[PDB]
Every structure is written in structure tokens, then in C-alpha cells.
Design an enzyme around this catalytic site. Sequence first.
Site, PDB file in Angstrom:
ATOM      1  CG  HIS A   1     -10.614-103.714 -71.647  1.00 15.50           C
ATOM      2  ND1 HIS A   1     -11.306-104.756 -70.639  1.00 15.50           N
ATOM      3  CD2 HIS A   1      -8.874-104.265 -71.311  1.00 15.50           C
ATOM      4  CE1 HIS A   1     -10.761-105.038 -70.441  1.00 15.50           C
ATOM      5  NE2 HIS A   1     -10.008-105.084 -70.154  1.00 15.50           N
TER       6      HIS A   1
ATOM      7  CG  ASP B   1      -3.144-108.306 -72.753  1.00 19.01           C
ATOM      8  OD1 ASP B   1      -2.891-108.377 -71.519  1.00 19.01           O
ATOM      9  OD2 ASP B   1      -3.820-108.125 -72.969  1.00 19.01           O
TER      10      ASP B   1
END
Lengths: 367, 367
Positions: free
Chosen positions: B248, B303
Site C-alpha cells: 500500500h 483488496d
Amino acid sequence: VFIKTTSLTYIDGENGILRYGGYDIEDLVEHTSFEEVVHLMLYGDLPTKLQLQRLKSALDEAYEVPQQVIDMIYSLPRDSDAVGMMETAFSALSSIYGMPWNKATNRDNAVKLVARASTVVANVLRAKEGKKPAIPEPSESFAKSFLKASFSRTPTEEEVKAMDAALILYADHEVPASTTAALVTSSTLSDIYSCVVAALAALKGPLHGGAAEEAFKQFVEIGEPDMTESWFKRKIIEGKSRLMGFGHRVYKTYDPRAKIFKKYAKVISERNSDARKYFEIAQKLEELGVETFGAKHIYPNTDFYSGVVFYALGFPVYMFTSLFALSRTLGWTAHVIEYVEDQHRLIRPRALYVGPLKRDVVPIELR
Amino acid sequence: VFIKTTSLTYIDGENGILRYGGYDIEDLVEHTSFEEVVHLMLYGDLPTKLQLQRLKSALDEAYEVPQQVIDMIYSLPRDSDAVGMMETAFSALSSIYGMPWNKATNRDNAVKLVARASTVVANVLRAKEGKKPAIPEPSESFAKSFLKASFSRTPTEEEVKAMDAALILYADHEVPASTTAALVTSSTLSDIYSCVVAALAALKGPLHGGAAEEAFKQFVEIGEPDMTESWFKRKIIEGKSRLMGFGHRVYKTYDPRAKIFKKYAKVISERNSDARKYFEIAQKLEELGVETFGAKHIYPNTDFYSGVVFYALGFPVYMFTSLFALSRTLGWTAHVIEYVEDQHRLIRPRALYVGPLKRDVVPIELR
């Protein structure tokens, strides 16, 4: 804040100059054609005879869209904003035709898109009027095919020329919110049709769309040329309403587009007493307006006579921003192609947190 | 470049903290509900009992849309991208329901919009599956009404809770291109539905949408838990493919959303052997992934397990980004309301001309 570089459009607001790809707008309007300007914006030069033949064939083959796209237009409420109807149609076109970004085929996809804008805008008018659908067909020009489809009658040569000029005149200018929304959407590599969807969604907002309408609505309100001085003395001088279609953030002179829309307005307005009446009112307001505002560098802008053209062609007032959009699909597509191919990055700005500090969820009984 | 201020969402990427309106995500998921978080994002606090009752009634009354909107969904090709189908439906909703910006009614319009997102996403799934349409109806919660409409079966309480959590978890985060496109469109005072249209147009691009799909597609490719080590050794270690659903730009720890999607995945996956198998593969890759990448501060992101949830609920893989969008309509609407009400200006950047110098149109014979 410069969002991008461009080779497309040059504007000198002090001198009242607009050029596409180094060619002055007046020179493009008098001596070229929308098809040629399409080639200029996508490929960087005016086309040879062979290149123009090929572009014309590509346009012709693209006009037809699936019947589902037309059905959608015709299933919306007939009083819906025409730009919204376009938004919906282009969404459906995106779902049917959308392809990934690809240098060899981007311009071909854009060309097909511009053809299909013609189909969409013609059928938006026809849906809102309660007429049967019509798909543009080959003719001697894109402007004529569009008019034939819109109105189911062969237009005169002077009508064709005025539509062609309007297509060129509005093709590209600055980086308004519509072009910005297209750019953001292209930053994710969403397909070109969805880039246009975004542009239309922004165009629908009344701080962007609706300028050619609000200008022409002055004329409608006046009603008769011999009432112009009165309406001006009352609404503009005494009530200091803005005179719409006057003034510009960049041009300190006549907008080079204004003079041109005026010339074509004069020619095609004379046939019909209604169009002539509004042309005559607009001319009178132009005079009173420049007499009052010209010393302040506030002159007619592109939106002052464009309605007069569109009205003279037979388009209702509710179509004016959609007819702007038809033209501006060219600049939208050409900007996003430039951006993706030459200058790509994902657009991801930031938000500064100024909200509440840490707190605990209280049970709802305690609220 | 800060595009705006916000009171909505706080993120501490060093510490793995996400808060909405000062409330930590885990506290909101465990002790509240999507309806309550809707109230938080639009009104700035968790609701009292009466405020929640009123919001629930407003949601209920909004689910129904005109049949033309459903017909449009069902007229698109069934293999069309689900986010594009949403784009089209929301365009039609904009044309039917779009209203001007108005402080007294902005939040009410947003609430109706979120209800209608539920209707849209349920019917996108049903169109693509070739099933009859279904409009959400009142139930004990928004998450349950959505699941009932999607699947035509009463969900279990643990399925309801996992959907509710997913709605909260994806409600808002950063200012991705979708939120940016919404903001640009709101800058012109285009209606809130058209702000969402723009956001979806951007979401459809593969540099934005498709993350929960690409993560889960790893699991599908692996097929069986006892093949995970092999696929990892081959695809990630030897072929240095990115491990999707890991890493991320902000979080240097587990994404606080990841842990939560995992918990609900474990519960609802155990019923079905298929969902369990993918949960078991994902868990094994999580281990191999953190063993390989954790020292580099690359951990599961939001995700990685969200697909496992959606799949366990009964949603095909092609729905995953649409289910993200369902949730994110909340952040989209709340950002544009904040922007218009508190921080408005027309978004109009600039383009620097670097193209050709003045040149004259040559007749086409001479080209």
C-alpha cells in the site's frame, strides 16, 4: 496551475487570436472543413487528399450504433436535459465499444467517437421532439449528414457551411471542467468513450453548460427589435444584469469566434422571419452592448451569436449546449490522447483531515 | 497537492489507523452499521434512535426507480463491464432525478442516491446472470435488503453482517481518481448523480478498478490449497510477479481493513466447500506473503480478502469493483457535499501551448 502541455490550441487574448495547430481559426473556417480539422487535431496536420478520403470513410462506417443505444435515448423523459441524454448514450457506447488505450488505434477510436456524437446529438433532438430516429448517412460532408439526420430535409449549402463553421469554432478552447473531467478519467486508462461521459457530466452543470442558451434567451425575452433599447435600458443599465454572451476571462477584444458565428448567422437567418428577427435583436444588442462596455474591453464572446446560428438551422434552444458538445468531442478526445500518450500519470491528489479527534462509539441508547 | 479539506476520513499509515469522523474503523464495524455510518458521513455524528429511524425510512422509499432504468441495464451486452453498466444506470438516474445543489436537501439527495446504488448493483448482477429484475425492499438492514435483492433468498445473519462490514470498510479512503472526477464534476454544480457518473467513468479504468478481482484471481489460478506453495515459488519468487492484494502507498502495516475482511471471510466461507477452498488458499498465501514481504513493510491490503467475502456471499468475481462502488458512493457523495458547501470554486486549470508556430492553410492539392 498547468495540468498539461498541448500542441492543439493557442490563444492570445490581448490580440484576439485563436489557432489550432498553428492555423488561425478564420483561415480554418474559410478554407477547410470540420473533417480536415479533425485530422489536424488528431494527427497534427491538415490532411492530403488520400488521408481525407480515408478519414471520411472511417466516419461513414461509424455512424451506425446499436439500436439499444437509440432506445435508451428514447426511454428517457422527453423533458430531460439534452446534455444528460448525451451522457446516458455515451455511457452505453462506452459499455458497447470501449477499448483499452493503444497508440496504433487511439486516433481511429476518436474518429469513430466523433461520428457517433453526430448520431447521438441528432437523436437526442428527435427524441425530445417526438420524431422517429434517424442515423446519419454519407453525404458530401459531416455537417450535412448531421443536418440531414436532425431534420429529415436536405439542407442548403449555406446551412451546411454554417454548421461546419460552428463545428470548427467550438472544437477546442482552454481546459474547462469538462476537459478536466476527461483528463482525470483518462488517467486511469478508462476508455475514450467514458472520458467523454465524464466531460458531459461536468458540462451538465450550470456553471459550465448553458451559456449559448442564456445568451439567446435575452433575445427571446426582448421579442421584437424595436423593444431592444427598452430592455437594455431597464435590464442592463438600470437593473445591472450581466449582458450574456459579452465578456471573457482571456479575450480583451472581440472573440475571434464571435465575428465568425455572426457572419454565418446573417446569411442563414434571412430566409426565415423568426431567425431574422432574433438576428436583428442580437445585432442591436451588440451595438448597445459595445457602446456601453467596449471601452472596458468587454466585447461579444463566442456564445453571443452561436445560438442565432443554431436557431437559424432549425435547432431549439434546448439543444445549444449539446451542439457545443458535438464540436468539443474533438478537443476532448485530442486532449486525452495527448495526455495518455505523452504525459501519463494517475491523478491522485490529497485531502487534509480537519475533522474530529479520536472518540469512542457510544451505544445508541446513550445518544 | 491538497485538493480540499475534509472532516470525513483520517488515515495514519505508520500506525495502521483509519477513522471516519474520529471513530476507528474497527469500532464502527463491530458496534454500528452501514446506515449509521451513512448518517456519520453526511451529518457528522452517529445518529440517535429517532434520526436512524428517519434515515431508514428515507432509504426504503428510495429503492424503487423507474422501469426505464432497469430496462437500460438489461439492454446492455451481458458481457459488459459491470462498472460500465452502473455508469449507464446512474446516467439515466441523473437525467430522471438530478436536482440543483441546495444546502437543505443535499444530504437527503445523497441518501436516496445510496439506496438507488443498491438497486443498481443488484440488477447489474441479475442482468449479467440472465435473471429477472428485483428491487430492494425494506428489511432489518440495508445490507440484508441488498442481499435479498441480489440473490432472491433470505441471507443468514452472519452473511448480513459480512455485507454490512464490507459496506463500511470500503466507504471512504484517500482521494482516488474516482473521487477526483466527482469533485471536478461538482465544481460546475452538476447534480450529485452525475458526480457519481464521473466517478464510475474513472473507476472503470484498469489503473483504478479491478484490484479486488486481480487479487482473487490469484486464488482461482492456484485452484487448490496444496498448490499454493508451488504457485508462490514459481510466480512470486522465481517469476517476480507482484503479489496482488499486498502492499500500500500509505499503510506500512496490515491495512486495518484487511484484518476485518478476513474475520468475516472465515465465518461465511465455511458453509460452502468452494468459498472455504479459496479462503484456505488466501490464508496460505497470506503466510507465505508476510514471511517474504513483511520485513519490507508490505502486508495484506484491503483488496486481499474482500473478494473472498464477496465470493462467499455468492457474488461472481466480475461484481467485485461494483461492490466496492456501492460502498464508495457514500464517500463520493459526502466529499462532493463538503466541497460544494464549504469549499466551492469552478475547477479550470491551464494547458501550456508547445505546438506549431503560425502557418497558413495550403490548398489540399499542394499537400
